[PDB]
């Protein structure tokens, strides 16, 4: 079978490279019986469209933001609690936990997909065209976000003017004033060069940004038992590999952003004032897994169960 795998990330992106590597290994491990054609950069549609077609089985596979999945499955919102993870190594440990993996079990019924495991991209940061000395400076700023509710809620609590926008439009929107600021990670701030029309880079690490490897449940059901096991395990390995890339590269991409001539500041949870508490109130009855995920995150940190 020639499977198709969609992503929204550009070609240089870690996810796209991981999907290509998965595709190569599947071809080899299957003795050429199967192949994967990778379609990055939104070639097959936006993420919402891709999920619709995973659900029907018109699309076989995706490396998808958990952000999009949360639009369909609001419990995935739990991963976006601000400052749940203290850094990318903590985030990776959370995403590998039994608590997190247990949350995947609902996906075949609730979204028509099998989730094999979690990967991630980088922590979320803020880039702005003007000075930002306190959270009050975010008030009324047209601020680009990924189109999902957890981040919309965070910025609405802060009083910004969040504006959903997909990746390809972001650079131009900054350059032309359609937005004043963006929510982004350091990999894409580097790759998309969004720092070019920014004044201030705020390294806030305010939210994690998980990824999930998905197989259409309709397609999975048509696979032989041997292939269900082999393909899901292999995909899980490649999804998991992204966590180690970000563990290594996150501080490297961050340091590169000290060399682009802009005002560079690190801020912590206190910077955001009451927005974190407001977010909790919004999400308490939307994402029932949140208390258990918070306990898991706290235990990983207390036990020093990651590189820190």
From Swiss-Prot:
GO terms for biological process: C4-dicarboxylate transport; transmembrane transport. Disulfide bonds: none annotated. It comes from the Bacteria. The gene is dctP. This is Solute-binding protein SPO1773. One of its GO terms (molecular function) is carbohydrate binding. The lineage of its organism: Bacteria, Pseudomonadati, Pseudomonadota, Alphaproteobacteria, Rhodobacterales. It is found in: Periplasm. 3-hydroxybenzoate binds at residues 13-15, 124, 144-146, 185. It comes from Ruegeria pomeroyi (strain ATCC 700808 / DSM 15171 / DSS-3) (Silicibacter pomeroyi).
């Amino acid at each position: 079978k020639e499977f198709r795998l969609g992503l929204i990330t550009p070609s240089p992106h870690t996810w796209t490279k991981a999907a290509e590597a998965f595709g190569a290994e599947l071809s080899e491990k299957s003795g050429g019986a199967h192949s994967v054609s990778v379609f990055p950069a939104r070639q097959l549609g936006n993420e919402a469209q891709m999920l619709q077609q995973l659900q029907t089985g018109a699309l076989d596979m995706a490396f998808m933001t958990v952000a999009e999945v949360s639009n369909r499955v609001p419990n995935m919102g739990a991963f976006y609690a601000p400052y749940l993870a203290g850094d990318i190594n903590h985030a990776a440990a959370i995403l590998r936990s039994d608590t997190a993996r247990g949350m995947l079990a609902v996906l075949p019924q609730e979204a028509g997909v099998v989730g094999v495991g979690f990967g991630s991209a980088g922590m979320r940061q803020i880039l702005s065209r003007g000075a930002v000395n306190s959270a009050a400076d975010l008030s009324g700023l047209k601020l680009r976000i990924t189109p999902f509710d957890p981040i919309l809620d965070f910025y609405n609590a802060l009083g910004a003017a969040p504006t959903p926008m997909p990746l390809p439009a972001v650079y131009d929107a900054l350059a032309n004033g359609q937005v004043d600021a963006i929510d982004m990670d350091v990999e894409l701030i580097n790759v998309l060069k969004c720092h070019e029309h920014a004044d201030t880079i705020l390294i806030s690490n305010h939210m994690m940004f998980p990824m999930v490897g998905l197989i259409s449940a309709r397609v999975y059901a048509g696979m032989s038992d041997a292939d269900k096991a082999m393909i899901s395990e292999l995909m899980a390995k490649h999804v998991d590999s992204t966590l180690d890339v970000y563990m290594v590269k996150e501080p490297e991409w961050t340091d590169a952003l000290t060399k682009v001539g802009k005002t560079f500041k690190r801020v912590d949870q206190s910077f955001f004032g009451d927005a974190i508490a407001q977010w909790e109130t919004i999400w308490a009855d939307k994402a029932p897994s949140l208390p258990e995920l918070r306990k898991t995150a706290a235990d990983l940190q207390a036990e020093n169960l990651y590189f820190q």
